[PDB]
């Protein structure tokens, strides 16, 4: 028994073909079964023929005869069809409203999440369907990880390097950081975990959560988890107040945080507020400063990633009493300077998926572009708060959508929060970039911030661009552009100061090649988000949708504090780079 996800209508029916088994009301369950391939229907029992060795599960082909269910062939003389009168049979048949269109719920229930339009709908549908879609999508995502073949240690060529043997008749996952494995050792009558791991082409290079002397017969699977059902909305109902509510501002504030006092007041005058913080505009400074501006307030700092929460902890360590901080960790190495798992501490730092059920004066959800509607709902379910602050930048990178291949995901579709920021705009904006030379700020201001991002620094005159397509090679799941690495090799011989530079590309394989040939440290654009470096050398590698995504490019070039060399494939983004052009040697 439960609630019709389309009506709320009290019901005893869940669609059994739907991977999430949503409750559907006689009306909505019917309109669902007759307009899709979904025909299995679950109640207190499953609407299946209880005849001995009959394979009828279609509810349109079944009858209640006795207190048991039968097809045409097996039914008793006295029976009524389970599925008639524009309704499917079960409890609470008299209380049932239906819907004018069930189109959206069908699309969500039946889509394979490979098309952009699938994620668009999960984001523009009604709120109750945003939760359904969010569960359905995450469950699909975690089942797609089982489709992957087991990798097994066939030889241990060295340390940090392995030879893998791969399960037959199953695909192998891409070997980049976005796929995190879990090793296992071959025991008497079972298997025990041996840390999480990642891999990159060699043989294969492996960067594991722990060190070991791992040996042959050890194997690896992408660990998938149970997806719990969602209750809370992605956003609580907005409220605007006429005075700061449930928060007492400080009388004395430092000139370090004085620029955010207007914004901290806004935070107190609405139920939830959105802060767009471009690169190096001071998001974590903002988040910690709120604590000092409302000193007596209980604040739960949350984000999807351990890294994001840890970065909030690092900043907190610099400004807030340590004795008033706690880091929530469930029973990966993260921040270990606060007392661990003290829920009742004034300042709680904690990933979304580890949150305790608790209340608070403020909740700060950081790096909001990475969040999914699943994470949004979870926060609202675990944390009942006077005020919610969502800090991030919808011009930066979303969570990877492992299933998505057809279409690009626009920032207004990353989650309910980025939707608000891209349609009504953000409640608050950090409009001065402190990190980047002005040439990079001028470029991303035009490119993604509507000319509202200002440069703190001057021009470095150390921002260069080269238009060089070179030669693209493709391996199993990545791209390589050796001639673009060649151009950088040659650039470094003539400009050896740049040997302090980080190498960034949109592809892990390009990175692997560049590390051998250049020996710069390397990052994927995606791994670089939230880091800065004095000098960045960036090879676009290809002119794909991946390598031209304006959000990725934005993250790539705003990593630089002083200078950047962009070797570009795409004439479009090259022409948008407000950098010094260089000819090809
Ligand atoms: C009131 C008893 S019955 O009408 O035979 N049962 C039924 C079954 C499916 C839909 C509607 C129904 F009413
Ligand atoms: C919500 C359960 S959890 O995911 O285990 N995270 C947590 C929460 C509070 C104390 C200790 C904890 F570990
Ligand atoms: Zn269904
Ligand atoms: Zn219904
Ligand atoms: Zn039968």
From Swiss-Prot:
Effect of residue 228 to I: In strain: Omicron/BQ.1.1
Domain (+)RNA virus helicase C-terminal: 431-585
Result for mutant: residue 360 to V: In strain: Theta/P.3
Subcellular location: Host endoplasmic reticulum-Golgi intermediate compartment
LRR repeat residues: 223-243
Residue numbers binding Zn(2+) 11: 4, 7, 25, 28
Binding residues annotated for a ribonucleoside 5'-triphosphate, in chain numbering: 277-284
Domain annotation (+)RNA virus helicase ATP-binding: ranges: 252-430
Reactions this protein catalyses: ATP + H2O = ADP + phosphate + H(+)
Annotated binding of Zn(2+) 13, by residue: 49, 54, 71, 74
Binding site for Zn(2+) 12: 15, 18, 32, 38
Subunit (UniProt): Interacts with nsp8 to form the replication-transcription complex (RTC): nsp12, nsp7, two subunits of nsp8, and up to two subunits of nsp13. Interacts with host TBK1; this interaction inhibits TBK1 phosphorylation and decreases by 75% IRF3 phosphorylation, which leads to reduced IFN-beta production.
General function of this protein: Plays a role in viral RNA synthesis. Multi-functional protein with a zinc-binding domain in N-terminus displaying RNA and DNA duplex-unwinding activities with 5' to 3' polarity. Activity of helicase is dependent on magnesium. Binds to host TBK1 and inhibits TBK1 phosphorylation; the interaction with TBK1 decreases IRF3 phosphorylation, which leads to reduced IFN-beta production.
Name the record gives this protein: Helicase nsp13
Annotated source species: Severe acute respiratory syndrome coronavirus 2
Residue span relative to the full protein: 5326 to 5917 of 7096
């Amino acid at each position: 028994v439960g609630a019709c996800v389309l009506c709320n209508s009290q019901t005893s029916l869940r669609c059994g073909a739907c991977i999430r088994r949503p409750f559907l009301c006689c009306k909505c369950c019917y309109d669902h079964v007759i307009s899709t391939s979904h025909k299995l229907v679950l109640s207190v029992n499953p609407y299946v023929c209880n005849a001995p060795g009959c394979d009828v599960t279609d509810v349109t082909q079944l009858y209640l005869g006795g207190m048991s269910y039968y097809c045409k062939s097996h039914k008793p003389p006295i029976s009524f069809p389970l599925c008639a009168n524009g309704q499917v049979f079960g409890l609470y048949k008299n209380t049932c409203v239906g819907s004018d269109n069930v189109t959206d719920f069908n699309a969500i229930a039946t889509c394979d999440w490979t098309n952009a339009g699938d994620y668009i709908l999960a984001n523009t549908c009604t709120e109750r369907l945003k939760l359904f879609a969010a569960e359905t999508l995450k469950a699909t995502e975690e089942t797609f990880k089982l489709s992957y073949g087991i990798a097994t240690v066939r030889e241990v060529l060295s340390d940090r390097e392995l030879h893998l043997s791969w399960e037959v008749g199953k695909p192998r996952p891409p070997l980049n950081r976005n796929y995190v494995f879990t090793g296992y050792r071959v025991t008497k009558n079972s298997k025990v975990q041996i840390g999480e791991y990642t891999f990159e082409k060699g043989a294969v290079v492996y960067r594991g959560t722990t060190t070991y002397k791992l040996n042959v017969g050890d194997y690896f699977v992408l660990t998938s988890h149970t997806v719990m059902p969602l209750s809370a909305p992605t956003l609580v109902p907005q409220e605007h107040y006429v005075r700061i509510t449930g928060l007492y501002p400080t009388l004395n504030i430092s000139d370090e945080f004085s620029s955010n006092v207007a914004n901290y007041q806004k935070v107190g005058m609405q139920k939830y507020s959105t802060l767009q913080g471009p690169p190096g505009t001071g998001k974590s400074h903002f988040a910690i400063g709120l604590a000092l501006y409302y000193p007596s307030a209980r604040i739960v700092y949350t984000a999807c990633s351990h890294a994001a929460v840890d970065a909030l902890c690092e900043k907190a360590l610099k400004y807030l009493p340590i004795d008033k901080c706690s880091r929530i960790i469930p029973a990966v190495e993260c921040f270990d300077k606060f007392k661990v798992n003290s829920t009742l501490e004034q300042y709680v730092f904690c990933t979304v998926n580890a949150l305790p059920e608790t209340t608070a004066d403020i909740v700060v959800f950081d790096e909001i572009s990475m969040a999914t509607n699943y994470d949004l709902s979870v926060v609202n379910a675990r944390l009942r708060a006077k005020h919610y602050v969502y800090i991030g930048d919808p011009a930066q990178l979303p969570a990877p959508r492992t299933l998505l291949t057809k279409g690009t995901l626009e920032p207004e579709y990353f989650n309910s929060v980025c939707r608000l920021m891209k349609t009504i705009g953000p409640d608050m904006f950090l409009g001065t970039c402190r990190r980047c030379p002005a040439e990079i700020v001028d470029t991303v201001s035009a490119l993604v911030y509507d000319n509202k991002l200002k440069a703190h620094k001057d021009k470095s005159a150390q921002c260069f661009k080269m238009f060089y397509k070179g030669v693209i090679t493709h391996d199993v799941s990545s791209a390589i552009n050796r001639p673009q690495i060649g151009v950088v090799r040659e650039f470094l011989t003539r400009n050896p100061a740049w040997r302090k530079a980080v190498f960034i590309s949109p592809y892990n394989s390009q990175n692997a090649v560049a590390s051998k040939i250049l020996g710069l440290p390397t990052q994927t654009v995606d791994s670089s988000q939230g880091s800065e470096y004095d000098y960045v050398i960036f090879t676009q590698t290809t002119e794909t949708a991946h390598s031209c995504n304006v959000n990725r490019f934005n993250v790539a070039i705003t990593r630089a504090k002083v200078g950047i060399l962009c070797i570009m494939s795409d004439r479009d983004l090259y022409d948008k780079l407000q950098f010094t052009s260089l000819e090809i040697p």
